[PDB]
Amino acid sequence: MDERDALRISREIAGEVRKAIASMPLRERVKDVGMGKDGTPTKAADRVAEDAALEILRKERVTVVTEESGVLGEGDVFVALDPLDGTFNATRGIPVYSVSLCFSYSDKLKDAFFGYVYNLATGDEYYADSSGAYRNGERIEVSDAEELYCNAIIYYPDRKFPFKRMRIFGSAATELCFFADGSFDCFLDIRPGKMLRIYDAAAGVFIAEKAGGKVTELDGESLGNKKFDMQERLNIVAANEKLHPKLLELIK
Amino acid sequence: MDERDALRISREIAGEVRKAIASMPLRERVKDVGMGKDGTPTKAADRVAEDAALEILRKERVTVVTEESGVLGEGDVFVALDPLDGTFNATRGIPVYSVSLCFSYSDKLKDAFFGYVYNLATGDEYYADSSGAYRNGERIEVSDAEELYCNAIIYYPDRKFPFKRMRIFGSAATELCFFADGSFDCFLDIRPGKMLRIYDAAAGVFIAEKAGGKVTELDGESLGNKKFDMQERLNIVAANEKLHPKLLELIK
Ligand SMILES: O=P(O)(OC[C@H](O)CO)OC[C@@H](O)CO
Ligand SMILES: O=P(O)(OC[C@H](O)CO)OC[C@@H](O)CO
Ligand SMILES: O=P(O)(OC[C@H](O)CO)OC[C@@H](O)CO
Numbered sequence: 001m002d003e004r005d006a007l008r009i010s011r012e013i014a015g016e017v018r019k020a021i022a023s024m025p026l027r028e029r030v031k032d033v034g035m036g037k038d039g040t041p042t043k044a045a046d047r048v049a050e051d052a053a054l055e056i057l058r059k060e061r062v063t064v065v066t067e068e069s070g071v072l073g074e075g076d077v078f079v080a081l082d083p084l085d086g087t088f089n090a091t092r093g094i095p096v097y098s099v100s101l102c103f104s105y106s107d108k109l110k111d112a113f114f115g116y117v118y119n120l121a122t123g124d125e126y127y128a129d130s131s132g133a134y135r136n137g138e139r140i141e142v143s144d145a146e147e148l149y150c151n152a153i154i155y156y157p158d159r160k161f162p163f164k165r166m167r168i169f170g171s172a173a174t175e176l177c178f179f180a181d182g183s184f185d186c187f188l189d190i191r192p193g194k195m196l197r198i199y200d201a202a203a204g205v206f207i208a209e210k211a212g213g214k215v216t217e218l219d220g221e222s223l224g225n226k227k228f229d230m231q232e233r234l235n236i237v238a239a240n241e242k243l244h245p246k247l248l249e250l251i252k
Numbered sequence: 253m254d255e256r257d258a259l260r261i262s263r264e265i266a267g268e269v270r271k272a273i274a275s276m277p278l279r280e281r282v283k284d285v286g287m288g289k290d291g292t293p294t295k296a297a298d299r300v301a302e303d304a305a306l307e308i309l310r311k312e313r314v315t316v317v318t319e320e321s322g323v324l325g326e327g328d329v330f331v332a333l334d335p336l337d338g339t340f341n342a343t344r345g346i347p348v349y350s351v352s353l354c355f356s357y358s359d360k361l362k363d364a365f366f367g368y369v370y371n372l373a374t375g376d377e378y379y380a381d382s383s384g385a386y387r388n389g390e391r392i393e394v395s396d397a398e399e400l401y402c403n404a405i406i407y408y409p410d411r412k413f414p415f416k417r418m419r420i421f422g423s424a425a426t427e428l429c430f431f432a433d434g435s436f437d438c439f440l441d442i443r444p445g446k447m448l449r450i451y452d453a454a455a456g457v458f459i460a461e462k463a464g465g466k467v468t469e470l471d472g473e474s475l476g477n478k479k480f481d482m483q484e485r486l487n488i489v490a491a492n493e494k495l496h497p498k499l500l501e502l503i504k
């Protein structure tokens with residue numbers, strides 16, 4: 001498979017998922033319908049999203065690792081799929097939620113070759129391949145902020161910080177893209193419990209890196225060895241080259 | 253002037269402001285074009301919104317209290333106007349920003365008779381009059397959550413809190429309505445510097461009160477005496493009757 005295919009497949013999937021979610025009233029969306037292989041509940045919105053996505057994906061030589069249904073398939077290409085990220089927002093009609101896809105030649109993020117995050121409420125399309133990072137077809141790049149006094153997306157603040165702004169939107173996949181296009185200066189998930197899962201962050205990280213960002217684990221450790229499995233968890237410190245180590249110092 | 257008038261005026265304003273912002277490219281929206289009477293910079297997006305609003309508003313026998321142009325007019329009905337709340341989200345194409353109007357028979361919040369908050373990105377219309385609180389025409393009400401382990405919007409968290417989720421969206425006017433329709437369980441702005449301004453919160457508070465919420469200042473004291481002037485500042489603690497005092501203890 002190549003990044004050209006990944007784009008088509010992803011775009012095809014975005015269409016069906018967007019269509020499914022939009023046609024579903026909020027009353028329905030918010031209903032708990034099952035237990036997810038990930039160990040959290042599967043809302044109805046999660047379900048109709050995943051089933052739409054899977055039906056397109058199965059047809060490929062991939063191993064899908066997805067939030068509600070767990071690990072599916074045998075293919076040598078691994079696909080980290082959050083069928084619906086920001087599920088909570090979508091149940092309340094809050095317009096920040098996305099489908100997220102990260103394609104990789106192995107079960108490790110270091111071998112990622114395509115990232116896709118598509119805002120299902122606005123139609124904003126983020127992706128990245130070897131040619132760079134895009135938002136609705138246009139090249140993007142992170143910001144050049146040098147001072148800690150910046151615009152931060154941070155899960156979760158637990159003390160007094162020096163940021164200009166803090167925001168928490170509820171879709172890590174989308175929020176990493178907000179950082180990738182430079183809307184925010186950094187993205188931090190520093191929650192002690194290590195909460196982010198591979199399908200939440202993979203596409204977002206890849207897109208953010210191609211956009212020029214430095215994206216690491218909690219102590220600067222590279223993320224290259226993170227696995228496309230259900231047990232994997234992540235902290236993330238993401239910011240441009242200059243700003244990044246200043247942040248690593250700050251949360252120490 | 254009556255609550256039916258304010259509805260019409262508000263809708264007329266919403267339309268013209270929605271139009272002005274939509275036709276403005278992000279590159280233009282984000283330019284600083286002046287200093288607001290509020291003491292924070294007026295973005296181009298703020299300016300085009302306010303000019304659109306004032307155009308309609310100053311045809312009325314009102315005193316307008318607005319973010320960029322300050323106190324205008326001389327009528328006996330006071331109008332707290334945030335021509336554009338969530339201005340930062342608007343300059344990044346992040347879909348959580350609104351126009352906010354509160355109409356009052358005196359210069360005090362206790363004499364409010366109409367509240368209006370229109371999400372300029374989604375077209376979701378929140379308002380409230382004597383007949384209750386509405387979202388796109390449908391009645392709304394707050395959540396019956398009883399435990400501190402709930403869904404919170406909190407500016408800004410600075411310690412370990414017991415909430416289920418925390419979110420910060422960047423539009424206090426809109427987020428007050430998220431609480432009012434029960435999307436979230438509580439809204440807290442407990443920033444020690446007292447950052448919120450009259451036009452940021454007035455409409456939101458009214459709508460939330462008309463929807464069953466208890467909405468107070470930091471210590472539980474009534475907000476009824478808060479003034480429609482530029483000098484006024486607020487902390488907010490909003491939750492349903494049960495949850496509310498539990499929150500009051502928590503933040504001491
Ligand atoms: O069921 P909800 O939508 O909460 C969603 C999360 O449990 C989903 O993982 O409603 C609010 C409370 O969390 C429920 O008691
Ligand atoms: O536990 P959270 O505070 O909130 C969870 C809800 O957003 C579930 O949809 O953070 C986790 C998010 O799911 C990460 O994208
Ligand atoms: O859009 P900004 O200019 O972004 C901050 C940095 O890029 C400036 O150095 O900040 C917004 C205004 O300060 C709000 O009043």
Ligand SMILES: O=P(O)(OC[C@H](O)CO)OC[C@@H](O)CO
Pocket residue numbers: 164165166337338339340341422423424425447448449452
């Ligand atoms: O973190 P902030 O300083 O706080 C904003 C509050 O006044 C709520 O509307 O964000 C500032 C931006 O100017 C916003 O558009």
Ligand SMILES: [Mg+2]
Pocket residue numbers: 067082083084085086087
């Ligand atoms: Mg998800």
Ligand SMILES: [Mg+2]
Pocket residue numbers: 082084085086172199200
């Ligand atoms: Mg997720």
Ligand SMILES: [Mg+2]
Pocket residue numbers: 040041042043046067084087
């Ligand atoms: Mg989920």
Ligand SMILES: [Mg+2]
Pocket residue numbers: 298319334335336337338339
């Ligand atoms: Mg404003």
Ligand SMILES: [Mg+2]
Pocket residue numbers: 319334336337338451452
């Ligand atoms: Mg404001």
Ligand SMILES: [Mg+2]
Pocket residue numbers: 292293294295298319336339
């Ligand atoms: Mg402003």
